[PDB]
Design a protein around this motif. Structure first.
Motif, PDB file in Angstrom:
ATOM      1  N   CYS A 181       7.464   0.549   2.855  1.00 26.72           N
ATOM      2  CA  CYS A 181       6.459   1.114   3.737  1.00 26.72           C
ATOM      3  C   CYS A 181       5.993   0.021   4.690  1.00 26.72           C
ATOM      4  O   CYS A 181       5.652  -1.090   4.244  1.00 26.72           O
ATOM      5  CB  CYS A 181       5.294   1.709   2.949  1.00 26.72           C
ATOM      6  N   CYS A 182       6.057   0.325   6.012  1.00 30.31           N
ATOM      7  CA  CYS A 182       5.693  -0.559   7.123  1.00 30.31           C
ATOM      8  C   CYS A 182       6.658  -1.760   7.288  1.00 30.31           C
ATOM      9  O   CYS A 182       6.252  -2.840   7.716  1.00 30.31           O
ATOM     10  CB  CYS A 182       4.234  -0.999   7.023  1.00 30.31           C
TER      11      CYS A 182
ATOM     12  N   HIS B 155       0.728  -1.261   0.000  1.00 29.60           N
ATOM     13  CA  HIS B 155       0.000   0.000   0.000  1.00 29.60           C
ATOM     14  C   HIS B 155       0.753   1.305   0.000  1.00 29.60           C
ATOM     15  O   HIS B 155       0.099   2.344  -0.012  1.00 29.60           O
ATOM     16  CB  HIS B 155      -0.925   0.025   1.223  1.00 29.60           C
TER      17      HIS B 155
ATOM     18  N   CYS C 284       3.226   3.505   8.683  1.00 34.18           N
ATOM     19  CA  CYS C 284       2.084   4.337   8.303  1.00 34.18           C
ATOM     20  C   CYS C 284       0.793   3.891   8.990  1.00 34.18           C
ATOM     21  O   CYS C 284       0.805   2.878   9.686  1.00 34.18           O
ATOM     22  CB  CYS C 284       1.938   4.441   6.786  1.00 34.18           C
TER      23      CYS C 284
ATOM     24  N   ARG D 206      -2.413   3.705   7.272  1.00 36.10           N
ATOM     25  CA  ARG D 206      -3.411   3.441   6.246  1.00 36.10           C
ATOM     26  C   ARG D 206      -4.369   2.342   6.683  1.00 36.10           C
ATOM     27  O   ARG D 206      -5.539   2.624   6.920  1.00 36.10           O
ATOM     28  CB  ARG D 206      -2.756   3.081   4.902  1.00 36.10           C
TER      29      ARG D 206
HETATM   30 ZN   LIG Z   1       2.431   1.514   5.284  1.00 35.75          ZN
END
Ligand SMILES: [Zn+2]
Ligand SMILES: CNC(=O)c1cnn2c(O)cc(-c3ccccc3)nc12
Length: 348
Positions: free
Chosen positions: A223-224, A217, A231, A233
Protein backbone atom coordinates in the motif's frame (compact mmCIF):
# COMPACT_ATOMS: atom_id res chain seq x y z
CA UNK A 1 -15.12 17.39 -4.58
CA UNK A 2 -11.55 17.23 -3.21
CA UNK A 3 -10.20 20.51 -4.78
CA UNK A 4 -9.89 22.58 -1.56
CA UNK A 5 -8.58 19.40 0.17
CA UNK A 6 -5.85 18.86 -2.47
CA UNK A 7 -5.08 22.64 -2.28
CA UNK A 8 -4.48 22.41 1.53
CA UNK A 9 -2.27 19.31 1.14
CA UNK A 10 0.00 21.25 -1.29
CA UNK A 11 0.25 24.24 1.12
CA UNK A 12 0.99 21.79 3.99
CA UNK A 13 3.76 20.26 1.81
CA UNK A 14 5.38 23.72 1.61
CA UNK A 15 6.01 23.70 5.38
CA UNK A 16 8.03 20.41 5.12
CA UNK A 17 11.56 22.06 4.72
CA UNK A 18 11.10 24.58 7.64
CA UNK A 19 9.80 21.77 9.96
CA UNK A 20 12.68 19.50 8.85
CA UNK A 21 15.40 22.09 9.65
CA UNK A 22 13.77 22.96 13.03
CA UNK A 23 13.67 19.18 13.83
CA UNK A 24 17.44 19.20 13.07
CA UNK A 25 18.03 21.81 15.86
CA UNK A 26 15.92 19.70 18.29
CA UNK A 27 17.74 16.41 17.35
CA UNK A 28 21.04 18.17 18.14
CA UNK A 29 20.05 19.49 21.62
CA UNK A 30 18.16 16.28 22.58
CA UNK A 31 21.10 13.92 21.63
CA UNK A 32 23.26 16.15 23.92
CA UNK A 33 20.75 16.00 26.84
CA UNK A 34 20.48 12.23 26.53
CA UNK A 35 24.33 11.85 26.61
CA UNK A 36 24.41 13.91 29.90
CA UNK A 37 21.29 12.24 31.41
CA UNK A 38 22.78 8.70 30.86
CA UNK A 39 25.56 9.66 33.35
CA UNK A 40 23.17 9.62 36.35
CA UNK A 41 22.60 6.20 38.00
CA UNK A 42 18.77 6.56 37.87
CA UNK A 43 18.50 7.68 34.19
CA UNK A 44 21.17 5.23 32.86
CA UNK A 45 18.96 3.37 30.36
CA UNK A 46 17.40 6.63 29.08
CA UNK A 47 16.77 6.90 25.34
CA UNK A 48 14.85 8.82 22.71
CA UNK A 49 11.35 7.48 21.91
CA UNK A 50 11.18 8.23 18.12
CA UNK A 51 7.37 8.63 18.20
CA UNK A 52 5.20 11.64 17.44
CA UNK A 53 3.73 13.57 14.49
CA UNK A 54 7.11 14.21 12.94
CA UNK A 55 8.28 10.50 12.72
CA UNK A 56 4.75 9.51 11.63
CA UNK A 57 5.04 12.15 8.78
CA UNK A 58 1.85 13.94 9.96
CA UNK A 59 3.42 17.14 11.44
CA UNK A 60 1.09 19.59 9.58
CA UNK A 61 2.29 22.98 10.94
CA UNK A 62 4.10 24.88 13.79
CA UNK A 63 7.84 24.39 13.04
CA UNK A 64 8.57 26.41 16.22
CA UNK A 65 6.80 23.77 18.41
CA UNK A 66 8.06 20.13 18.98
CA UNK A 67 7.22 17.35 21.46
CA UNK A 68 9.94 14.79 22.43
CA UNK A 69 9.59 11.54 24.41
CA UNK A 70 12.34 10.05 26.61
CA UNK A 71 11.99 6.31 27.35
CA UNK A 72 13.56 4.75 30.48
CA UNK A 73 13.59 1.01 30.84
CA UNK A 74 12.26 -0.21 34.14
CA UNK A 75 13.00 -3.96 34.94
CA UNK A 76 10.26 -6.04 36.68
CA UNK A 77 7.42 -3.78 37.55
CA UNK A 78 4.00 -4.25 39.08
CA UNK A 79 1.04 -1.99 38.17
CA UNK A 80 -1.92 -1.12 40.42
CA UNK A 81 -4.89 0.43 38.53
CA UNK A 82 -5.99 3.67 40.20
CA UNK A 83 -9.73 4.03 41.06
CA UNK A 84 -11.03 1.83 38.14
CA UNK A 85 -9.71 4.41 35.60
CA UNK A 86 -8.34 1.74 33.14
CA UNK A 87 -5.65 4.25 31.98
CA UNK A 88 -4.12 5.52 35.28
CA UNK A 89 -1.80 3.35 37.43
CA UNK A 90 0.61 3.30 40.35
CA UNK A 91 4.11 1.94 39.58
CA UNK A 92 5.28 -0.60 42.14
CA UNK A 93 8.20 -3.09 42.23
CA UNK A 94 8.42 -6.35 42.09
CA UNK A 95 18.29 2.54 40.36
CA UNK A 96 15.00 4.39 41.08
CA UNK A 97 15.00 3.48 44.87
CA UNK A 98 15.53 7.21 45.66
CA UNK A 99 12.08 8.09 44.15
CA UNK A 100 10.03 5.49 46.07
CA UNK A 101 7.43 7.29 48.29
CA UNK A 102 6.58 4.07 50.14
CA UNK A 103 6.35 0.97 47.91
CA UNK A 104 5.01 3.33 45.13
CA UNK A 105 7.32 5.23 42.70
CA UNK A 106 6.76 9.02 43.01
CA UNK A 107 5.96 10.83 39.74
CA UNK A 108 6.89 14.18 41.41
CA UNK A 109 10.27 13.02 42.86
CA UNK A 110 11.12 11.32 39.52
CA UNK A 111 10.24 14.41 37.44
CA UNK A 112 12.04 16.72 39.89
CA UNK A 113 15.40 14.92 39.38
CA UNK A 114 14.69 14.84 35.59
CA UNK A 115 13.99 18.65 35.66
CA UNK A 116 17.15 19.08 37.88
CA UNK A 117 19.64 17.23 35.50
CA UNK A 118 17.97 18.96 32.41
CA UNK A 119 18.28 22.39 34.13
CA UNK A 120 21.98 21.57 34.91
CA UNK A 121 22.66 20.39 31.34
CA UNK A 122 21.19 23.42 29.45
CA UNK A 123 23.65 25.91 31.16
CA UNK A 124 26.65 23.73 30.07
CA UNK A 125 25.45 23.80 26.36
CA UNK A 126 27.00 26.94 24.70
CA UNK A 127 27.03 25.82 20.96
CA UNK A 128 23.32 26.84 20.47
CA UNK A 129 21.15 29.13 22.69
CA UNK A 130 18.95 26.91 24.93
CA UNK A 131 16.72 28.32 27.73
CA UNK A 132 14.45 26.19 30.00
CA UNK A 133 10.90 27.43 30.73
CA UNK A 134 9.63 26.90 34.37
CA UNK A 135 7.05 24.15 35.24
CA UNK A 136 3.25 24.98 35.31
CA UNK A 137 6.95 18.14 31.83
CA UNK A 138 10.09 20.17 30.77
CA UNK A 139 9.94 22.91 28.10
CA UNK A 140 13.01 24.25 26.22
CA UNK A 141 13.51 27.21 23.91
CA UNK A 142 16.08 26.67 21.17
CA UNK A 143 17.80 29.74 19.82
CA UNK A 144 14.86 31.85 20.78
CA UNK A 145 12.31 30.35 18.44
CA UNK A 146 11.78 26.60 18.86
CA UNK A 147 9.89 25.28 21.89
CA UNK A 148 10.49 21.67 22.95
CA UNK A 149 8.06 19.90 25.26
CA UNK A 150 10.05 16.98 26.87
CA UNK A 151 8.10 14.03 28.38
CA UNK A 152 9.58 11.16 30.45
CA UNK A 153 8.05 7.74 29.85
CA UNK A 154 8.79 4.48 31.73
CA UNK A 155 9.26 1.43 29.52
CA UNK A 156 7.85 -1.95 30.51
CA UNK A 157 8.57 -5.06 28.48
CA UNK A 158 5.72 -6.79 30.45
CA UNK A 159 2.40 -7.98 28.92
CA UNK A 160 -0.01 -5.08 28.35
CA UNK A 161 -2.50 -4.35 31.23
CA UNK A 162 -5.91 -6.08 31.16
CA UNK A 163 -7.64 -2.76 30.09
CA UNK A 164 -6.01 -3.14 26.60
CA UNK A 165 -7.17 -6.77 26.13
CA UNK A 166 -10.11 -5.79 23.86
CA UNK A 167 -8.35 -2.75 22.33
CA UNK A 168 -6.34 -2.29 19.08
CA UNK A 169 -9.10 -3.76 16.83
CA UNK A 170 -6.77 -4.16 13.76
CA UNK A 171 -7.49 -7.91 13.03
CA UNK A 172 -9.70 -7.36 9.96
CA UNK A 173 -7.54 -4.45 8.70
CA UNK A 174 -3.87 -5.01 9.60
CA UNK A 175 -4.35 -8.76 10.50
CA UNK A 176 -4.40 -10.70 13.78
CA UNK A 177 -0.77 -11.78 12.95
CA UNK A 178 0.30 -8.08 13.23
CA UNK A 179 -1.86 -7.52 16.41
CA UNK A 180 -0.04 -10.44 18.08
CA UNK A 181 3.39 -8.98 16.97
CA UNK A 182 2.44 -5.46 18.16
CA UNK A 183 1.19 -6.57 21.64
CA UNK A 184 4.56 -8.41 22.15
CA UNK A 185 6.22 -4.92 22.01
CA UNK A 186 6.70 -2.84 25.25
CA UNK A 187 4.26 -0.30 26.69
CA UNK A 188 4.92 3.09 28.26
CA UNK A 189 3.76 5.09 31.23
CA UNK A 190 3.85 8.88 31.18
CA UNK A 191 3.37 10.74 34.51
CA UNK A 192 -0.13 12.23 34.34
CA UNK A 193 -2.18 12.93 37.46
CA UNK A 194 -5.90 11.96 37.55
CA UNK A 195 -8.92 13.91 39.01
CA UNK A 196 -10.09 13.62 42.70
CA UNK A 197 -5.76 15.42 41.78
CA UNK A 198 -3.82 12.20 42.38
CA UNK A 199 -0.26 13.51 41.82
CA UNK A 200 1.34 9.96 41.95
CA UNK A 201 -0.32 8.27 38.91
CA UNK A 202 1.01 7.24 35.50
CA UNK A 203 -1.00 7.04 32.23
CA UNK A 204 -0.54 4.37 29.55
CA UNK A 205 1.16 5.37 26.31
CA UNK A 206 1.27 3.50 22.94
CA UNK A 207 2.93 6.22 20.84
CA UNK A 208 5.17 3.57 19.21
CA UNK A 209 2.19 1.43 18.16
CA UNK A 210 0.44 4.53 16.69
CA UNK A 211 3.60 5.15 14.63
CA UNK A 212 3.90 1.52 13.51
CA UNK A 213 0.22 1.52 12.42
CA UNK A 214 0.53 4.92 10.65
CA UNK A 215 3.79 4.07 8.81
CA UNK A 216 2.57 0.57 7.74
CA UNK A 217 -1.14 1.36 7.33
CA UNK A 218 -2.61 -0.77 4.59
CA UNK A 219 -4.22 -4.21 4.31
CA UNK A 220 -1.83 -4.84 1.41
CA UNK A 221 1.91 -4.74 2.31
CA UNK A 222 2.55 -2.71 -0.92
CA UNK A 223 0.00 0.00 0.00
CA UNK A 224 1.38 3.39 -1.21
CA UNK A 225 4.37 1.76 -3.01
CA UNK A 226 2.86 1.94 -6.56
CA UNK A 227 0.46 4.07 -8.77
CA UNK A 228 -2.29 1.39 -8.59
CA UNK A 229 -1.98 1.14 -4.74
CA UNK A 230 -2.00 4.80 -3.59
CA UNK A 231 -4.41 5.52 -0.67
CA UNK A 232 -5.63 8.68 1.16
CA UNK A 233 -5.41 7.52 4.83
CA UNK A 234 -2.54 9.81 5.97
CA UNK A 235 -4.04 12.73 3.92
CA UNK A 236 -7.38 12.37 5.78
CA UNK A 237 -5.56 12.47 9.18
CA UNK A 238 -3.49 15.52 8.02
CA UNK A 239 -6.74 17.28 6.96
CA UNK A 240 -8.60 16.42 10.22
CA UNK A 241 -5.58 17.65 12.29
CA UNK A 242 -5.41 20.86 10.17
CA UNK A 243 -9.22 21.39 10.47
CA UNK A 244 -8.90 21.42 14.33
CA UNK A 245 -5.72 23.56 14.37
CA UNK A 246 -7.35 26.16 12.07
CA UNK A 247 -10.59 26.29 14.10
CA UNK A 248 -8.60 26.40 17.39
CA UNK A 249 -6.60 29.38 15.90
CA UNK A 250 -9.78 31.13 14.61
CA UNK A 251 -11.38 30.90 18.12
CA UNK A 252 -8.30 31.33 20.41
CA UNK A 253 -9.90 34.61 21.74
CA UNK A 254 -13.05 32.47 22.79
CA UNK A 255 -11.35 29.54 24.76
CA UNK A 256 -13.90 26.67 24.07
CA UNK A 257 -11.66 24.46 21.78
CA UNK A 258 -8.74 24.54 24.26
CA UNK A 259 -9.51 21.05 25.64
CA UNK A 260 -9.49 19.46 22.13
CA UNK A 261 -6.24 18.01 20.79
CA UNK A 262 -4.78 16.29 17.77
CA UNK A 263 -5.02 13.08 19.89
CA UNK A 264 -8.86 13.24 19.69
CA UNK A 265 -8.59 13.55 15.89
CA UNK A 266 -5.97 10.72 15.68
CA UNK A 267 -8.10 8.39 17.90
CA UNK A 268 -11.22 9.10 15.78
CA UNK A 269 -9.06 8.44 12.66
CA UNK A 270 -7.96 4.96 13.88
CA UNK A 271 -11.65 4.18 14.57
CA UNK A 272 -12.53 5.03 10.98
CA UNK A 273 -9.59 2.82 9.78
CA UNK A 274 -11.15 -0.10 11.79
CA UNK A 275 -14.57 0.60 10.18
CA UNK A 276 -13.05 0.71 6.63
CA UNK A 277 -10.40 -2.06 6.62
CA UNK A 278 -10.08 -2.27 2.82
CA UNK A 279 -7.48 -0.24 0.89
CA UNK A 280 -10.25 0.17 -1.80
CA UNK A 281 -12.23 2.16 0.78
CA UNK A 282 -9.22 4.60 0.85
CA UNK A 283 -8.69 5.18 -2.87
CA UNK A 284 -6.87 8.46 -3.79
CA UNK A 285 -9.80 9.30 -6.18
CA UNK A 286 -12.22 9.05 -3.19
CA UNK A 287 -10.34 11.61 -0.93
CA UNK A 288 -13.45 13.88 -0.78
CA UNK A 289 -15.74 10.98 0.28
CA UNK A 290 -13.06 9.62 2.72
CA UNK A 291 -12.48 12.94 4.47
CA UNK A 292 -16.28 13.40 4.66
CA UNK A 293 -16.56 10.04 6.66
CA UNK A 294 -13.75 11.27 8.96
CA UNK A 295 -15.56 14.67 9.56
CA UNK A 296 -18.89 12.73 9.99
CA UNK A 297 -17.49 10.11 12.45
CA UNK A 298 -15.76 12.82 14.49
CA UNK A 299 -19.06 14.76 14.73
CA UNK A 300 -20.91 11.65 15.87
CA UNK A 301 -18.35 11.34 18.75
CA UNK A 302 -18.92 14.99 19.69
CA UNK A 303 -22.77 14.56 19.63
CA UNK A 304 -22.85 11.20 21.44
CA UNK A 305 -20.02 12.32 23.90
CA UNK A 306 -18.22 9.03 23.06
CA UNK A 307 -14.60 8.82 21.77
CA UNK A 308 -13.01 5.66 23.12
CA UNK A 309 -9.25 5.31 23.45
CA UNK A 310 -8.14 2.98 20.59
CA UNK A 311 -6.09 0.85 23.05
CA UNK A 312 -8.27 1.18 26.19
CA UNK A 313 -11.92 0.72 25.04
CA UNK A 314 -13.33 1.61 28.50
CA UNK A 315 -11.48 4.97 28.61
CA UNK A 316 -13.71 7.74 27.02
CA UNK A 317 -11.71 10.80 25.84
CA UNK A 318 -15.01 12.68 25.26
CA UNK A 319 -16.45 12.05 28.76
CA UNK A 320 -18.50 14.98 30.24
CA UNK A 321 -16.03 14.85 33.17
CA UNK A 322 -13.18 15.75 30.66
CA UNK A 323 -14.90 18.02 28.14
CA UNK A 324 -18.11 19.87 28.89
CA UNK A 325 -21.11 19.40 26.54
CA UNK A 326 -21.23 23.15 25.58
CA UNK A 327 -17.62 22.86 24.20
CA UNK A 328 -18.44 19.78 22.09
CA UNK A 329 -21.53 21.60 20.81
CA UNK A 330 -19.37 24.63 19.78
CA UNK A 331 -16.88 22.34 17.98
CA UNK A 332 -19.91 20.61 16.25
CA UNK A 333 -21.43 24.02 15.24
CA UNK A 334 -18.09 25.12 13.66
CA UNK A 335 -17.20 21.84 11.87
CA UNK A 336 -20.72 21.65 10.35
CA UNK A 337 -20.58 25.33 9.22
CA UNK A 338 -17.13 24.62 7.61
CA UNK A 339 -18.38 21.46 5.81
CA UNK A 340 -21.43 23.40 4.60
CA UNK A 341 -19.46 26.31 3.21
CA UNK A 342 -16.73 24.38 1.36
CA UNK A 343 -14.28 24.80 4.31
CA UNK A 344 -13.58 28.62 4.47
CA UNK A 345 -11.12 28.02 7.40
CA UNK A 346 -8.82 26.13 4.95
CA UNK A 347 -7.93 29.10 2.61
CA UNK A 348 -7.70 31.26 5.86
ZN1 LIG B 1 -1.68 3.58 1.77
C1 LIG C 1 -5.73 14.66 25.11
N1 LIG C 1 -4.80 13.57 24.93
C2 LIG C 1 -3.44 13.86 24.48
O1 LIG C 1 -3.07 14.96 24.24
C3 LIG C 1 -2.46 12.70 24.28
C4 LIG C 1 -1.31 12.69 23.54
N2 LIG C 1 -0.80 11.40 23.59
N3 LIG C 1 -1.66 10.63 24.34
C5 LIG C 1 -1.62 9.32 24.69
O2 LIG C 1 -0.52 8.54 24.32
C6 LIG C 1 -2.62 8.80 25.46
C7 LIG C 1 -3.68 9.60 25.83
C8 LIG C 1 -4.80 9.13 26.73
C9 LIG C 1 -5.56 10.10 27.38
C10 LIG C 1 -6.55 9.70 28.25
C11 LIG C 1 -6.75 8.33 28.45
C12 LIG C 1 -6.04 7.37 27.78
C13 LIG C 1 -5.02 7.77 26.95
N4 LIG C 1 -3.68 10.89 25.51
C14 LIG C 1 -2.67 11.41 24.75
Amino acid sequence: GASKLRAVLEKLKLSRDDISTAAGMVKGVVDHLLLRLKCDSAFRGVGLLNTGSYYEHVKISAPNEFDVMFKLEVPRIQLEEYSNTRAYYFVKFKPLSQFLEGEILSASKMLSKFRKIIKEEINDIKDTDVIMKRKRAVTLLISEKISVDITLALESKSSWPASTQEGLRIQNWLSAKVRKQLRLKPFYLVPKHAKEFQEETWRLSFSHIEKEILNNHGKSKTCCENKEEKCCRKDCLKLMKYLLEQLKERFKDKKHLDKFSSYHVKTAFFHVCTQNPQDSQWDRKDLGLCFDNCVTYFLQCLRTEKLENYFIPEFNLFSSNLIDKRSKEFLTKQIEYERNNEFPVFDE
